[PDB]
Amino acid sequence: SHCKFEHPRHGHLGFLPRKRSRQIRGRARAFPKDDATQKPHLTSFMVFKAGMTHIVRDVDRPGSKVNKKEVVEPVTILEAPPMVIVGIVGYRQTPVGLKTIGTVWAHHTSVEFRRRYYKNWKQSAQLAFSRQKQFANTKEGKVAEARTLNAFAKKASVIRVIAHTQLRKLRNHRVGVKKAHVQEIQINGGNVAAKIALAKSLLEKEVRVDSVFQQSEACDVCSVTKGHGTEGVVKRWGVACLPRKTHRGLRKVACIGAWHPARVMYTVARAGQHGYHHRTQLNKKIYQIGRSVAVEPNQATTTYDLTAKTITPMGGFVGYGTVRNDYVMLKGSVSGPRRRVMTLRRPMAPQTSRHLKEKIVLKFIDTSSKIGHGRFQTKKEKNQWFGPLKKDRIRREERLRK
Amino acid sequence: AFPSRKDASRAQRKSAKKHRPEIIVIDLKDHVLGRAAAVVAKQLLLGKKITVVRCEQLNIAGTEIRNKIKYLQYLRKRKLTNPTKGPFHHRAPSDVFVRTVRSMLPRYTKRGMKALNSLVAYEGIPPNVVRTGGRVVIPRAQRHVCYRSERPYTVLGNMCKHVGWKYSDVVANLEKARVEKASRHHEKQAKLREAWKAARKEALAKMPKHNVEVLKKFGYA
RNA sequence: GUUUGAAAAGCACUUUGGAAAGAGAGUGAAAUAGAACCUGAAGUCGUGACAAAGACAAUGGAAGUACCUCCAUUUCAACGGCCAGAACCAGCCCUACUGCAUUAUCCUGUCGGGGGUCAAAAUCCGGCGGGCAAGAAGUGCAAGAAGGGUCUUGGU
RNA sequence: UCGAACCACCUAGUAGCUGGUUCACAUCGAAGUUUCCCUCAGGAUAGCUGGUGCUAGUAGAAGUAUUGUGCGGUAAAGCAA
RNA sequence: UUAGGGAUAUGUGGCGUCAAAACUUAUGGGCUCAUUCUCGAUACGUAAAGGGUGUUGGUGGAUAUCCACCGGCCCCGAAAAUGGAUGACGCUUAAGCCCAAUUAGUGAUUGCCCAUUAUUCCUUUGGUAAGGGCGGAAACAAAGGAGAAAGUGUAGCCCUUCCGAUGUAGAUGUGGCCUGGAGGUUAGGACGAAGCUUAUGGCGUGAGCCUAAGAUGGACCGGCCUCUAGUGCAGAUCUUGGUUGGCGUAGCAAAGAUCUAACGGAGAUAUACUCAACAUGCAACGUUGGAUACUGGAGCGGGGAAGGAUUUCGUGCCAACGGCACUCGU
RNA sequence: UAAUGAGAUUCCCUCUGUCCCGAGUUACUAUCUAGCGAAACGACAGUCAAGGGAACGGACUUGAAGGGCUAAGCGGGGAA
RNA sequence: CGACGUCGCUUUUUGAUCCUUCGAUGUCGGCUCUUCCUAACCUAGCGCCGCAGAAGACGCUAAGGGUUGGAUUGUUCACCCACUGACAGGGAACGUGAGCUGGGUUUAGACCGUCGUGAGACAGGUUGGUUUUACCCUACUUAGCUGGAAAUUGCGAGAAAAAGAUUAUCCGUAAGCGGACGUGCGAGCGGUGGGUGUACGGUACGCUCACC
RNA sequence: GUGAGAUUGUGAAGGGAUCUCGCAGGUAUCGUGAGGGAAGUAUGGGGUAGUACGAGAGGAACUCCCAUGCCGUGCCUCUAGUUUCUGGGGUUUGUCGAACGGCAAGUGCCCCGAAGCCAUCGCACGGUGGUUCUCGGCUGAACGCCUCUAAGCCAGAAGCCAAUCCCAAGACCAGAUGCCCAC
RNA sequence: AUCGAAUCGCCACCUACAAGACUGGAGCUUGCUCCCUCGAAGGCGCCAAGUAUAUUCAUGAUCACAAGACA
Ligand SMILES: NC[C@@H]1O[C@H](O[C@H]2[C@@H](O)[C@H](O[C@@H]3[C@@H](O)[C@H](N)C[C@H](N)[C@H]3O[C@H]3O[C@H](CO)[C@@H](O)[C@H](O)[C@H]3N)O[C@@H]2CO)[C@H](N)[C@@H](O)[C@@H]1O
Numbered sequence A: 001s002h003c004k005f006e007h008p009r010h011g012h013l014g015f016l017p018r019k020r021s022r023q024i025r026g027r028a029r030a031f032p033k034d035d036a037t038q039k040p041h042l043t044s045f046m047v048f049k050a051g052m053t054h055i056v057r058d059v060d061r062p063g064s065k066v067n068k069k070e071v072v073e074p075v076t077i078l079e080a081p082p083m084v085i086v087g088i089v090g091y092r093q094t095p096v097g098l099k100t101i102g103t104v105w106a107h108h109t110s111v112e113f114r115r116r117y118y119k120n121w122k123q124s125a126q127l128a129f130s131r132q133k134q135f136a137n138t139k140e141g142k143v144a145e146a147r148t149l150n151a152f153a154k155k156a157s158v159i160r161v162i163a164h165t166q167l168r169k170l171r172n173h174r175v176g177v178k179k180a181h182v183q184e185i186q187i188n189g190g191n192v193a194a195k196i197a198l199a200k201s202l203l204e205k206e207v208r209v210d211s212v213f214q215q216s217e218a219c220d221v222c223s224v225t226k227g228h229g230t231e232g233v234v235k236r237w238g239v240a241c242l243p244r245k246t247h248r249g250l251r252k253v254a255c256i257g258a259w260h261p262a263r264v265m266y267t268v269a270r271a272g273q274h275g276y277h278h279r280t281q282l283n284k285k286i287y288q289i290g291r292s293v294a295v296e297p298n299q300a301t302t303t304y305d306l307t308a309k310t311i312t313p314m315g316g317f318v319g320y321g322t323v324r325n326d327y328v329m330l331k332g333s334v335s336g337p338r339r340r341v342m343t344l345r346r347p348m349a350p351q352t353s354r355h356l357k358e359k360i361v362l363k364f365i366d367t368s369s370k371i372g373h374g375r376f377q378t379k380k381e382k383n384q385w386f387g388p389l390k391k392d393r394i395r396r397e398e399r400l401r402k
Numbered sequence B: 001a002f003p004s005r006k007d008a009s010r011a012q013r014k015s016a017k018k019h020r021p022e023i024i025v026i027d028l029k030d031h032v033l034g035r036a037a038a039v040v041a042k043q044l045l046l047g048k049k050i051t052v053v054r055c056e057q058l059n060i061a062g063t064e065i066r067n068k069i070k071y072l073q074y075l076r077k078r079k080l081t082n083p084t085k086g087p088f089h090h091r092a093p094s095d096v097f098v099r100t101v102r103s104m105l106p107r108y109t110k111r112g113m114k115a116l117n118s119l120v121a122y123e124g125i126p127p128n129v130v131r132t133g134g135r136v137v138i139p140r141a142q143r144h145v146c147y148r149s150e151r152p153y154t155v156l157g158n159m160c161k162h163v164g165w166k167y168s169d170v171v172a173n174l175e176k177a178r179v180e181k182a183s184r185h186h187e188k189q190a191k192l193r194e195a196w197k198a199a200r201k202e203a204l205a206k207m208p209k210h211n212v213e214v215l216k217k218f219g220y221a
Numbered sequence C: 001g002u003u004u005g006a007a008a009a010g011c012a013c014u015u016u017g018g019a020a021a022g023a024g025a026g027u028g029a030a031a032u033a034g035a036a037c038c039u040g041a042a043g044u045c046g047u048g049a050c051a052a053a054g055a056c057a058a059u060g061g062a063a064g065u066a067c068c069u070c071c072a073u074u075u076c077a078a079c080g081g082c083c084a085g086a087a088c089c090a091g092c093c094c095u096a097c098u099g100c101a102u103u104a105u106c107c108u109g110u111c112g113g114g115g116g117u118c119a120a121a122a123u124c125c126g127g128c129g130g131g132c133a134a135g136a137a138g139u140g141c142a143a144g145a146a147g148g149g150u151c152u153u154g155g156u
Numbered sequence D: 001u002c003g004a005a006c007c008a009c010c011u012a013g014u015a016g017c018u019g020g021u022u023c024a025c026a027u028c029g030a031a032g033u034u035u036c037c038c039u040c041a042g043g044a045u046a047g048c049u050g051g052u053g054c055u056a057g058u059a060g061a062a063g064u065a066u067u068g069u070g071c072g073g074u075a076a077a078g079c080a081a
Numbered sequence E: 001u002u003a004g005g006g007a008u009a010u011g012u013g014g015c016g017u018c019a020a021a022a023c024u025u026a027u028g029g030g031c032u033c034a035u036u037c038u039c040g041a042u043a044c045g046u047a048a049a050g051g052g053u054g055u056u057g058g059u060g061g062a063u064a065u066c067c068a069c070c071g072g073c074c075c076c077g078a079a080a081a082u083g084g085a086u087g088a089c090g091c092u093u094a095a096g097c098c099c100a101a102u103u104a105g106u107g108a109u110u111g112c113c114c115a116u117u118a119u120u121c122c123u124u125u126g127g128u129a130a131g132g133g134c135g136g137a138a139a140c141a142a143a144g145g146a147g148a149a150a151g152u153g154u155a156g157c158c159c160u161u162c163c164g165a166u167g168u169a170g171a172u173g174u175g176g177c178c179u180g181g182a183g184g185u186u187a188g189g190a191c192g193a194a195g196c197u198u199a200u201g202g203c204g205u206g207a208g209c210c211u212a213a214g215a216u217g218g219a220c221c222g223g224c225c226u227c228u229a230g231u232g233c234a235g236a237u238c239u240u241g242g243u244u245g246g247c248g249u250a251g252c253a254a255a256g257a258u259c260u261a262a263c264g265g266a267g268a269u270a271u272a273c274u275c276a277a278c279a280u281g282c283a284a285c286g287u288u289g290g291a292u293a294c295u296g297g298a299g300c301g302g303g304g305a306a307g308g309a310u311u312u313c314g315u316g317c318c319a320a321c322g323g324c325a326c327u328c329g330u
Numbered sequence F: 001u002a003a004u005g006a007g008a009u010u011c012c013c014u015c016u017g018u019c020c021c022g023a024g025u026u027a028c029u030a031u032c033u034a035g036c037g038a039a040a041c042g043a044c045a046g047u048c049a050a051g052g053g054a055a056c057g058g059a060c061u062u063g064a065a066g067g068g069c070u071a072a073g074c075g076g077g078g079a080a
Numbered sequence G: 001c002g003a004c005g006u007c008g009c010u011u012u013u014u015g016a017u018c019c020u021u022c023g024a025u026g027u028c029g030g031c032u033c034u035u036c037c038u039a040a041c042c043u044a045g046c047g048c049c050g051c052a053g054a055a056g057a058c059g060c061u062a063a064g065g066g067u068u069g070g071a072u073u074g075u076u077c078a079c080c081c082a083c084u085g086a087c088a089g090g091g092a093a094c095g096u097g098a099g100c101u102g103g104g105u106u107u108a109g110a111c112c113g114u115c116g117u118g119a120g121a122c123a124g125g126u127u128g129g130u131u132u133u134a135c136c137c138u139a140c141u142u143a144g145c146u147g148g149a150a151a152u153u154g155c156g157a158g159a160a161a162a163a164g165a166u167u168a169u170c171c172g173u174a175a176g177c178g179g180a181c182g183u184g185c186g187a188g189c190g191g192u193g194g195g196u197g198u199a200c201g202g203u204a205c206g207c208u209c210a211c212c
Numbered sequence H: 001g002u003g004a005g006a007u008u009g010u011g012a013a014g015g016g017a018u019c020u021c022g023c024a025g026g027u028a029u030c031g032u033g034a035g036g037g038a039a040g041u042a043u044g045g046g047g048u049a050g051u052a053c054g055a056g057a058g059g060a061a062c063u064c065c066c067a068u069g070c071c072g073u074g075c076c077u078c079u080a081g082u083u084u085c086u087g088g089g090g091u092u093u094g095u096c097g098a099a100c101g102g103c104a105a106g107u108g109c110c111c112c113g114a115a116g117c118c119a120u121c122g123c124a125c126g127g128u129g130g131u132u133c134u135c136g137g138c139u140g141a142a143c144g145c146c147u148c149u150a151a152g153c154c155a156g157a158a159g160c161c162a163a164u165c166c167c168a169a170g171a172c173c174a175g176a177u178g179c180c181c182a183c
Numbered sequence I: 001a002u003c004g005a006a007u008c009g010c011c012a013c014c015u016a017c018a019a020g021a022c023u024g025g026a027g028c029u030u031g032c033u034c035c036c037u038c039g040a041a042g043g044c045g046c047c048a049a050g051u052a053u054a055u056u057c058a059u060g061a062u063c064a065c066a067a068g069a070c071a
């Protein structure tokens, strides 16, 4: 007999299996489509999540009820130290797939790059990339570098480079990892001879985030969801909770199937891992590509808001610290907790809708505290509400006593 | 499957010559899909090692729209409880042919698994198969003797590209690049092919004449 | 059932352990007869050594093979009760080699009347003249006293 | 322990109903139908079956034909009988 | 239509693969095209009325063209609840449908594949079984051989011949097997009986019997003829004893709660080196002190009845009990 | 029929997690270890689709899956 | 649209049957949740109208997606209130009780009516009336470990591969063509050594050990 | 061949033969992507426009913007909820002799409360190509004209298949790599 | 280095490619005539490095996996 009333089923069935991610980092399963009429350019960049805040900006949207009026939008801060290129891979088309031809290396690799090869670096011989380093400038090894660079020019359709996050310029105390996060970034643009020349030129040289993205564009954010353990069916799938007088329990799915087919189906919601899942989340509009504090002591300062202040709030981002490097600022949320490495990748969606072409100018960036209720935008404003306090008048008493 | 160091040191302790088993390589351009599959399913099960090549060129009788619907009725089948345990629907022409051979084998014994792993079934002609001897053909299954020429037929590479099989254009550029390469190799040695036959006509009258009218009785002149 | 043993000769003593006990010694034919102690089953379990083995739940039948076997039996010299090969008898089972009848709505010959064709041969119909269409017919019956089988029987 | 307590007995109560019924081979091998029965889940009865035979091994034989001689009112036909 | 096996030949059904056979036979003829349960296709066996200018034959009329009819295949008619079924793949110069052949207008027979059938050859077993031989013919030492019983049934008196053979319920036969005891006979056993054990073979169609080896046992017992019965187990929600998977699993969650140091105790402070300690002896017990709580005078206070009857008390003591623990204990 | 009712019913007020629509915290479990240690159950076992069948198969027919072994769940099957 | 006829599909009704279950398959409806089917209510394309427009009738391809909140009733059903683009119809042991609930049927108490001489009866009304077990196998959900291509072994040799596949340095294309340390001492491309500044802090670039 | 063990049922030291397998891989990173899953779906407003159409009554639609319901995946800046941070304070009864510091009442109670978690109770995001059904056609015969169909073509549905998205080599990846060993 | 094994056709002439209502080339009477490459062979290999009085072969005893195996 049919179900007596209709509701749409619970949970998208295309995000199955809802199992833990195989790896903690965001990894692109597909790059944008290669336009060979463009100029060669990188397509992804790894940033780390550093809390979130909100902004104020006026809206250019003709027809809308909020046209030329100021909105408050939440933004997420993603710290981006530059990544250093260490390799060049090239992939050739087969009827099986897309096979790797080989990789050249940079002749000089970082300590934190070849730390990724060790479960224990400090208690080790540390001699990785040590025979490749010395063979690469022999007579036969300078041949073998140019041997496989030519094999890219013959067989490869896809040229990628291998970068790593360069975590020692990320002077962060809470991201506790010291080995670098390694991914491959695909070159798109030009023919294969024009991709390798851009792959050779930025080799053993750091690439900075504002050379990959622009200020008022969008991107995809490949990132791994915040993990929540084993959760039941109400938290995980969002099923309705049963009436109060139910025996053995409320937070269950009552019927898990008919008598026939005499099996539980994959469509029936069950309990298990919730969170720590990979998500791609397209069309994340970017609002500000920031600049390091060694360059910019005044990061959150706008034309329309001349308060001299950085992007880091009062008392720091909660659980994270201070944004010490370049940063991107995206509209809204990205999947994952703070401190987690995330991949900003160029969009595969058509970036032609009038919401996505819109140029962004800000008017205010909230640099108030995220601990408690934020009240002051700078520490100069808290020293004008509060005058000299007691601990200041006895520090001024030690400074006169000397 | 690359050979391990136990399988590599024994080819150095014993000085193993490079070995190739007796492998019959069928060129399946313009063959009936199930008439070639039944000839192959019997030979594999008589102990023949068979490499099958050019599976995107196999023919199935009928309109392309007809045979494409019969694959989509096959793709309608899946285990509703858990489709990861279901019928797995292979879209490559090289994998459509392996299935059609396999459904003619005793698949659930070891003798029929030793015969389905004797079949390889590439599509296009890969670089390891090209220079390993002349390809063979199945003349009782070749569409010009098996299909009435007024009836439509269906190339398997075209039926399969519209139901899946995202490597149609890759195969078409690997086989355009081969026939260009293999025709450059064949304009070469045309002064080697003509060199021998102008030496095998010149070997006559340089050889004794009592071995020529026995070479003309059996028609080998 | 107390039925340990013939007899308590019911384990002195040594040194590990707080002890239960253990490792040695000793008694006795026997201690794998050490105290509800003759025999010590099946089921079940541990251990040492091996045999392997995908997922067909297992077991099962048939027929071979691979490896094993504190098993049986036979054979070792001008000999076998073992394994092969050919030969030749007999039997039986295969297949080669064919005759007697029958043709007629048929064969052939020319003159017609019919056809088609550039003209005409043929298909077709009809006169009376001859007939054998001769491994000639796929029509009736066939009785023609072998070359091959016999790990399809027995023998020397 | 209650719409007739508990104990021992009569008592191994009685059951046309349910369950069980321990070695091998050989020679033969059925019935669910008839009649009667407070009979319809049972019996007795005839039949089919086995065992023992007996009697002068072709006799008083036959799920069959042929020839002769009887019996019939179903199919068809008819409604102009 | 059925004893235990071979060889040949069939039957029903088949010969594209699975799967034996047309290594997809012919040197046969036609017909058929069908685009989301996907034309069609092994009888029994589980879609119709009606329609088609799809194709292929027929019939009867008329002036190369029309008209009315009838048939074959194909399409429409033709819509259900897990993904699905000519058995599967597939097949379309069929591997489909209807006819027809047998190596093809060549000269005459039977293309070949499969049975618990048929023919025939062996072996067994039983007959309403049918015949023959059984007065030792002569002769023959060791250093050509053995048997020959007047017989229902045997290791069958010996040969030859013929036919049958499956079977529930059931009947019957068996010099058919097995167990306890009894009457007789003939023998075993401390040089090892019964019992037990089995990659211990042997042989019997079988029930079973017998040998061997025990690095098992330690005193009784076999065979044959008769007699006798508490005489044969796989199952009765069978009886009694034991064991086992579940399984080191469910659990040991009311009555708030314990911490500390010193002593006691075998219960520790327990280590092969080249080691300073942590990272290699953990957990747990009693007593007194101290800290922290609780019961809260309808008390985990102090006495009695009923009931119990040594649980009282001291001292030893820890095997089993006090579902954890114990050095404590009713 | 006043009074009375752990009686049966209906509406209104207050009221609220009954609900929209769920979230979050606590104690105790579960969970992991130390000690201790069962039972119910158990022919044999355990992946499916269709077909047939005593006319709803884990075993049969033809297909489709299936490397082995685990921990916590869970209530569709085992006509549990 | 379609009488009179007629040929059928359907198994969400009911009747008929008695095949399976009486050493037991938990016997209604809600609630929950997933999936299927199409005979399509809404949505995507359409054809056709007694289709001017607007609303709509009929039909086709399509089951991808959606298909409600309530009053009364134990209800399936029904019936109105209201929203909506629309509030389509069904299946899965009349899906789903070791998922719940227990209103209702379906015991023992009691009352009423009709029946009965009575005990009692009542597909009549009423009220009150224990919903037990997963720790096993599978399935499904997540969470670990780990072999294996003769899917454990054979030594049973197949590369989506190079081109001496017959001897042997590379580079770049086939005809061509670039150079390749020389003989324990040397040299060359190089990994690590000492002192005064450059590129986007510390790594690179200037000027003793292996190999050719 | 070379290493390592075992031959454990009846005492002991010896050393013969035989059997079992060890004799090459280990570790670390970047990817491939078969196959399987699979998702976004609806609505209202603006103007177009009081226009098309119509005697009048009446009365459309596409491009194009702006929002929204249902669903999905996240998120915690804001706002809201939650407090065993018993955080700071307030308050009642008992109680350490009183103040101090507290404590008891299974967290005494009341107000505010970080962080964390969390709400359609807040916030952000939710995309491409083809194939071909219905159908309307184009050339074009059968059938000297006609005809979308017979060959052949065109355009083309929220269906279907891919892209994106999620898992992913028992899909056994001579895909690439770092360092050791072994040849 | 265990290892004894089953396998028994080699090629830098096949190892290029379409077609079958054609695919040697042309004529014009379009089904016939005409041209040489005659339209039905991938080459080798099968015991003198090549068709010529050249020289080993047992006893491995009459079949047995070929007792050989770099072609
Ligand atoms: N191991 C396989 C099993 O052996 C069993 O039987 C075995 C045992 O009963 C039997 O026992 C052995 C005996 O062989 C051997 N020669 C002497 C030994 N005394 C016996 O062993 C006996 O005694 C010892 C202590 O004395 C006990 O521990 C042991 O449980 C007991 N079986 O050895 C037999 C094998 O030869 C079962 N019959 C059988 O189910 C199975 O085959």
Ligand SMILES: [Mg+2]
Pocket (backbone or CB within 6 Å): A227
């Ligand atoms: Mg966390």
Ligand SMILES: [Mg+2]
Pocket (backbone or CB within 6 Å): none
């Ligand atoms: Mg029968």
Ligand SMILES: [Mg+2]
Pocket (backbone or CB within 6 Å): none
């Ligand atoms: Mg019987």
Ligand SMILES: [Mg+2]
Pocket (backbone or CB within 6 Å): E230
């Ligand atoms: Mg008895």
Ligand SMILES: [Mg+2]
Pocket (backbone or CB within 6 Å): E253
């Ligand atoms: Mg507990």
Ligand SMILES: [Mg+2]
Pocket (backbone or CB within 6 Å): E296
């Ligand atoms: Mg108190």
Ligand SMILES: [Mg+2]
Pocket (backbone or CB within 6 Å): none
């Ligand atoms: Mg205890």
Ligand SMILES: [Mg+2]
Pocket (backbone or CB within 6 Å): none
């Ligand atoms: Mg009262």
Ligand SMILES: [Mg+2]
Pocket (backbone or CB within 6 Å): none
């Ligand atoms: Mg896919």
